[PDB]
Design a protein around this ligand. Structure first.
Ligand SMILES: Nc1ncnc2c1ncn2[C@@H]1O[C@H](COP(=O)(O)OP(=O)(O)O)[C@@H](O)[C@H]1O
Ligand SMILES: Nc1ncnc2c1ncn2[C@@H]1O[C@H](COP(=O)(O)OP(=O)(O)O)[C@@H](O)[C@H]1O
Ligand SMILES: Nc1ncnc2c1ncn2[C@@H]1O[C@H](COP(=O)(O)OP(=O)(O)O)[C@@H](O)[C@H]1O
Ligand SMILES: Nc1ncnc2c1ncn2[C@@H]1O[C@H](COP(=O)(O)OP(=O)(O)O)[C@@H](O)[C@H]1O
Ligand SMILES: [Mg+2]
Ligand SMILES: [Mg+2]
Ligand SMILES: [Mg+2]
Ligand SMILES: [Mg+2]
Lengths: 372, 372, 372, 372
């Protein structure tokens, strides 16, 4: 075998590439868009469905939608369409040759992982596959074997405590507040400035406002008082039509929802308390090593100042006699893919694949008894 | 204090009156018209601006325009002109004596509510005021404390779920499809019969066609097939010049845009799905009480058959094991004013006013921290 | 004196009534809920705190929380609120007249029993009180004087061996696995069917699923193989919104955690081995009489088939030459209250109260030297 | 022959080294831990069993257990695992060259000493071995030939009276109260402060609390009255997670169980009365020399104040006309190993080994007729 495929199917992006590389070749949005207008011109290649960067370019005339909602694939007719675009049109490989490392989030529905396995052996007919867990692979990329992993992407936020090779699956927290629920809260609080964004085409604009103007305030109630003297805080953003918006305290009110989830009306705790409550469910001996290894990964951890508020606010929860260290890489947007590239290239791993022969005598239920 | 003013400034009508009454004294259109022709005759009281029923009478020589567009006041020089006509020329009161209850739509720009507050204390110098929310006051008029309120007037349609005294502001939907966008769609589909209505003076005629000939079809695709045998469906309307029009399937194609907003080219859901999606954002315990209380209010809910298609089509979305009850009063055109008359006459309410003394030490920013 | 109060303050329910009765008058959940939403409606009796059945009815808009966690009262400001609701609003008595029999679990913190005693004499000013032990009072209700008592409620599971009037306090086992940790495990394994229950309001729904669909499998590995042919095992449950769920092998996987506590990640033994290890800490002469008297009590012993797996699996641990008899009443949900009604009505008991005069000259430390 | 091995296999520690040295090279806990969690990471040396200091370091994810319970080896599959770790991984010797001096407690099962002898000649194939008695070797280390030896380690407490070279085996007392039953009583009485320690990983923490905060009160009923004025007695201890505990009268209530064994429910006498009853079973002539030589050894005699309560309370039992002298060394934690180093280096001893040739013609029953 030449090499293996590492296809991180996130809720918002599809990271894909080959095992043993340092960056994914394929990074494109996980969108399938259908046209919603008339279609008067004849010829000129009017397809019925646009996937990824085509749907992101032609988005003004498309009804964009995501097949993956909060980590759960809900639109298997359209998720097969993204995988077909990934392997053939974006990596340009034959899936019948390469084994495919897939990822998903922990505490997930069991029918999700089975239906992935049924598609990869029947529709694509791969030789082998394996469904890993995203917070495990975030810890291969940091090279460490001990640490609680705050992985937060577009669909779901989850803590997985891992001591020296051994996960503690009774302490895995999962929180369905992620980047896509911050986009929906940012559309709600940009309305009070008088900027109505309604369609899914502007949902991809408010996301782009968030990725380059929103930061995390270290103290929320002081920055709110600083925003009353509204001079040194308002930045401008140029919309694709040409209009400019002046966004003020909404620069820090939407990432505060990570830390105060009651803004979007959730009876749950922030990402700083579901990390502390996930350590206080672990054994008392390993709590010293989990405080000193707080690996953050995923795109929702990419805000400015989020590693300096996690460290500021777990410290107020932890006992003061020991140190807290949030590990913030510069590549943690891709670290679920990086660790999958490491794990799929190991020599010890190559007996852990679910092969096609092993699939035929057990069906899709083989994936529970061999992965996790 | 004798009594308080309840001034429902809708996008299309100005309902105004006193607290504790059963009907508003002042109901007139929210139009400010300027003359656009020469003006040859000398004397005879040629004013420069006509407000309300004067502009509705002299509308053939006026450029009519609305200051309130989709709930947002955009023409503060002309909105002060309507309020001056309301208090002095139509209610005939002194605004320096009475406190004034104002209403607006939820999810609105914050500069809208501030600039209302700045005008009422500086230009009119009222003793006190309060800016309520229209879907809240629709629920005082029905006497209930629990229910999702489909309020749809001339400017905006919005659902507000309210459980037992407590609103759920993360589930407030707002949709900018209302009666004024149905008038614009009715002018577009009356063109295909060969009746061109172009100016704003005929915009007030097509609205009058809609208010007495348009109904909601219970099944759209059967009534469209019934319209192919075009005998039992075409009604006639006598225009002010004397001409008659024969309107057929346009009797039900324009209120279908409430339920299929793609007719006017909107990537959004109808009023039956933004009610179901606003209940499915609420907590799972209160969904049983919101299905049984669907309070409709505002003028765009006054079509024949709209309570029998909301109940018909939420039932196809809801699980079948429980009942849906659309509450359709006969007075729901005025129920935002009726509930404001109730709320301004309560004895528990009379400490919730923003007074003139309280305004002077906080400016116009007092209205966010005391109303909503 | 007319009669005495028997207030069984469990972790999940508050059983309360009078001495000498056959059933408690007051049975309501031990919940104090605070509202978490806005509160827009004016008047209509919006309290700040809801206790018991009010918080269980209005639970969709409340942050429900329990003051008693694993038998330990942690929220003395809110535990006084439940007792105030019990005596005044639910029994409708004057606490200044009646003596109050209280219960708690063995091996408990000493500051818990003192702070109960300090409240009942200062805040309520009862004439007398007494803090019993729950597994002792479970044995008055069965009428027996000899037997090991497996008491398992919502907060804690504990074995207390009692030979002929004499407890063996060196063999009292206490295990913090109870009904509330089975609710948390049932929410975790209903996620893999795709039913996310997140807030505390759905925590009261998953508990209601458990109380009427979960049973104890007599052999776990055969019922797991029966669940692979998933036809004769899946029952349905109708949620309050109207949705139905199809629960399969989760009907028996959550009460298996009583017998295999490693499912929720506990290095401890099941309820069948902590009964056998609590008998093998007793003297060798009384082990014959403790095998023949296994009194079960509390609500977590109410599953179908739990008396037939305790008897099946202690028999595999005990030597085969003698018989094991699990005593399963039909009233063992209330038997801690029933035995407290018996003990508070005895004529020999009425010199064992801690009186108000005796409290004033020793402080709250009188309760250790007189109760246990 | 170069030298001989002296392997003191205690119930809690494994002291091992060479004959003729002043301290054992190998001192590590006698624990074999198995992992109990999932094991998600691939590679990185996940063994199946951890012995000694590895299991003491990784103890948060291990089910720790002791193979030696009250002096009796119960887990011969895991006791061979500790000996394999001792000789190869911790002393780094070849057992085929060195003769091995082993120790055990008196009044022990005969199958224990045989199965030690069968392993050392078959599994390890030593040239010679000898199973001594621990209280005999405690008296070589003090250099004396006369004295009753109170040896108390982790598993068992035993008195052995020895007059001038001659033991009195009818007066050997053996008591199964030792350091491991004080750890279990300390976990029971730390619960009443509200510090629940449940797993075996916290059993190794409560032991570490006991080894540096617990002392022996000279008068128990006065220190109990001093603890009522709880200021000058409470010391603090920093747990590995970072939490601090405030331990008060539990500093002296757990070593009082050595002197009042009814605290853990034992119908037996303390270590001061089983020394007096072991002298009053000796002949009346040698009772004068046994009062003046009370050699204490083992780790449970290392508490502060235990030599000053033994001398205080045997004096109340002995007739007052003669003096009592408790011999408390500073090295009595290791004195069973020190005396074994002395005895294995003597020239008179080197004909008392059980050799491999002598083993082959008598089987494992040779050890009764040659050792004791
Ligand atoms: N530079 C950035 N700053 C803040 N947020 C970002 C940034 N880049 C991406 N995001 C957010 O992170 C999400 C994508 O994160 P990612 O971990 O790639 O998602 P997934 O793993 O689900 O594909 C997007 O929703 C986006 O809103
Ligand atoms: N009888 C009617 N039938 C149908 N539509 C009506 C009727 N009366 C008014 N409307 C529509 O409702 C709108 C006015 O409703 P109203 O609730 O008064 O608006 P607002 O609350 O903004 O004043 C107008 O656009 C009109 O087209
Ligand atoms: N019929 C039932 N079947 C199974 N479990 C039950 C049943 N009724 C109650 N439970 C469980 O028992 C607990 C309550 O038991 P109870 O003895 O009332 O506790 P407490 O003594 O703390 O009041 C609840 O957590 C509930 O989950
Ligand atoms: N410094 C100390 N103070 C009090 N107790 C101790 C101390 N050191 C060890 N112990 C107790 O003594 C036991 C170890 O004694 P030791 O003689 O080493 O046992 P063994 O002979 O079985 O190895 C441990 O269980 C510990 O609880
Ligand atoms: Mg991801
Ligand atoms: Mg209105
Ligand atoms: Mg109870
Ligand atoms: Mg020893």
């Amino acid at each position: 075998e030449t090499t293996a495929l590492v296809c991180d199917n996130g809720s918002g992006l599809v990271k894909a590439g080959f095992a043993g590389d340092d960056a994914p070749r394929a990074v494109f949005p996980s969108i399938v868009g259908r046209p919603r207008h008339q279609g008067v011109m004849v010829g000129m290649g009017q397809k019925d469905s646009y996937v990824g960067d085509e749907a992101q370019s032609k988005r003004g005339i498309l009804t964009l939608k995501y097949p993956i909602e909060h980590g759960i694939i809900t639109n298997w007719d359209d998720m097969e369409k993204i995988w077909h675009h990934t392997f053939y049109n974006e990596l340009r490989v034959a899936p019948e040759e390469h084994p495919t490392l897939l990822t998903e989030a922990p505490l997930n529905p069991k029918a999700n992982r089975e239906k992935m396995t049924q598609i990869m052996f029947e529709t694509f007919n791969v030789p082998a596959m394996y469904v890993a867990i995203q917070a495990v692979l975030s810890l291969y990329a940091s090279g460490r074997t001990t640490g609680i992993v705050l992985d937060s992407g577009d669909g779901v936020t989850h803590n997985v405590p891992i001591y020296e090779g051994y996960a503690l699956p009774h302490a895995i927290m999962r929180l369905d507040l992620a980047g896509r629920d911050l986009t929906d809260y940012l559309m709600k609080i940009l309305t009070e400035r008088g900027y109505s964004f309604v369609t899914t085409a502007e949902r991809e604009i408010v996301r782009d406002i968030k990725e380059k103007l929103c930061y995390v305030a270290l103290d929320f109630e002081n920055e709110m008082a600083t925003a009353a003297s509204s001079s040194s805080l308002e930045k401008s953003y140029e919309l694709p039509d040409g209009q400019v918006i002046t966004i003020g305290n909404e620069r820090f009110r939407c990432p505060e929802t990570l830390f105060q989830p009651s803004f979007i009306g959730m009876e749950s705790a922030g990402i700083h308390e579901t990390t502390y409550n996930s350590i206080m469910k672990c054994d008392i001996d390993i709590r010293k090593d989990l405080y000193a290894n707080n690996v953050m990964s995923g795109g929702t951890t990419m805000y400015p100042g989020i590693a300096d508020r996690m460290q500021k606010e777990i410290t107020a929860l932890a006992p003061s006699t020991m140190k807290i260290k949030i590990i913030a890489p510069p590549e943690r947007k891709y670290s679920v893919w990086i660790g999958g590239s490491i794990l799929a290239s190991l020599s010890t791993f190559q007996q852990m694949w679910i092969t096609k022969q092993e699939y035929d005598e057990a069906g899709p239920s083989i994936v529970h008894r061999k992965c996790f």
